[PDB]
Amino acid sequence: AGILEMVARGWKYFSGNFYYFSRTPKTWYSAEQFCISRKAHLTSVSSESEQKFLYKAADGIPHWIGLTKAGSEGDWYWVDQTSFNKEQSRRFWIPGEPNNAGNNEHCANIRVSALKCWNDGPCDNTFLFICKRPYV
Amino acid sequence: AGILEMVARGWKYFSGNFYYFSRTPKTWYSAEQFCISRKAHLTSVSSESEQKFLYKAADGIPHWIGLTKAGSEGDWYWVDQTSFNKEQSRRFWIPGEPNNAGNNEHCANIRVSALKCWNDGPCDNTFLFICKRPYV
Ligand SMILES: [Ca+2]
Ligand SMILES: [Ca+2]
């Protein structure tokens, strides 16, 4: 509906997209349910620059993003259905990650504040979250 | 993978579909994640016959089913993309449900062992679950 309005409504703006950083923590799925109801999806990271903005604006607090496995034993996909670049992700996971700790880590979160900031963790962990919505 | 091959692994067969009834409790999404790893989804309900097979096998124990909202404020649908008729479902909901308690009950389960067994509850409640894989 327009940049100023969306900004004025509390949304962040970075490079062709609106973002919503949740004021309360939810499980990955309850976070996605909210983003759908906000005409959005849990965020994707489709560049290094977008990764830079997203870790910065997270403020060192662990934020759910929109990476999830296609089934508890499947490969990662972006929920917003953009392509997942397996190779580009190398520069985005915290070293050691994805580690699949206790074989119950199928949802990914911005845990720290660096270029390498993603951690795989339990999908039922409650964290703050980022809804992504196109500027269309 | 063969009717007798599936029941020999612990799948249940009824009227053209295989169904996995779970051992351990899980949230709606993790349940669904587990489903997909076994080539299934959480179960959709198309006929009263299916409803009756499902509620009688569920034994009174609450079991998650594949009915969820298109977001926290959106419409009910089946996660396996079976078409959901609201008028047919009227028969299966517990009288007085779906109530949407605290604007928070965004997933459905088979709560009791009766025809009127569907209750809406928060997707973060941990219950046993029913996966469904179609026989082709
Ligand atoms: Ca991890
Ligand atoms: Ca209810």
For residue B77, the number of C-alpha atoms closer than 13 Å in the C-beta half-sphere is: 13
Domain ranges across chain B: 1-136
Please give the Cα distance from B133 to A135 (Å, whole number). 38
Contact (CB<8Å) A123/B70: no
Q: Would the CB atoms of A36 and B74 count as touching at under 8 Å? A: yes
Nearest to A19, CA basis, from A38, A46, A47: A38
- Contact call for residues A14 and A22 (beta carbons, < 8 A): no
- Mutation target vs A (from B22, B30, B39, B103; most A CBs, 10 A cutoff): B30
Burial of B102 (0-12, 13-18, 19+ CB in 10 A): exposed
Pairing assessment for the beta strands B63-69 and B128-134 based on DSSP bridges: parallel
Q: Just give the CATH number of A1-136.
A: 3.10.100.10
**CB–CB of B33 and A106 under 8 A?**
yes
Q: Are A123 and B71 inside 8 Å of each other by CB?
A: no
Report the distance separating Cα A102 and Cα A131, nearest Å: 28
| A109 CA distance to ligand 1 middle (Å) | 9
Dig out the tokens for B80 from the structure.
């396996």
Task: Dump strand ranges (E) for chain A.
Answer: 12-14, 17-21, 41-42, 63-69, 76-78, 107-110, 118-121, 128-134
Q: By CA distance, what is B33's nearest residue in A? A: A71
Q: Determination method here?
A: X-ray
Tell me the C-alpha distance between A71 and B35, whole Å.
Answer: 7
Contact B36, B12 (CB under 8 A): no
Tokens of A41: 């999806």
- Measured CA to CA, the distance from residue B61 to residue B95 in angstroms comes to 19
At what resolution in Å was this solved? 2.4
CA atoms within 13 A on the CB side of B29: 24
- Terminal Cα-to-Cα distance of chain A (whole angstroms): 8
Chain B hits for A73, Cβ within 8 Å: 37
Looking at beta carbons, which residues of chain B come within 8 Å of A28? 29
Continuous segment of H or E residues that includes residue B92: none
Distance CA B36, CA A70 (A): 7
Please report, as a single letter, which amino acid is at residue B25: P
Phi, psi (degrees; rounded to nearest 5) at B90: -50, -35
Provide the residue count of chain A.
Answer: 136
**What is the Cα–Cα distance from A120 to A108, expressed in whole angstroms?**
4
The per-residue b/e assignment along A32-49, b for 16 or more CB within 10 angstroms, e otherwise, is bbbbbbbebbbbbbbeee
CB-nearest to A33 from B33, B34, B71 is B71
A30, A107, A123: best to mutate for the B interface, most B CBs within 10 A: A30
User: What letter does residue A87 receive in the DSSP assignment?
Assistant: T
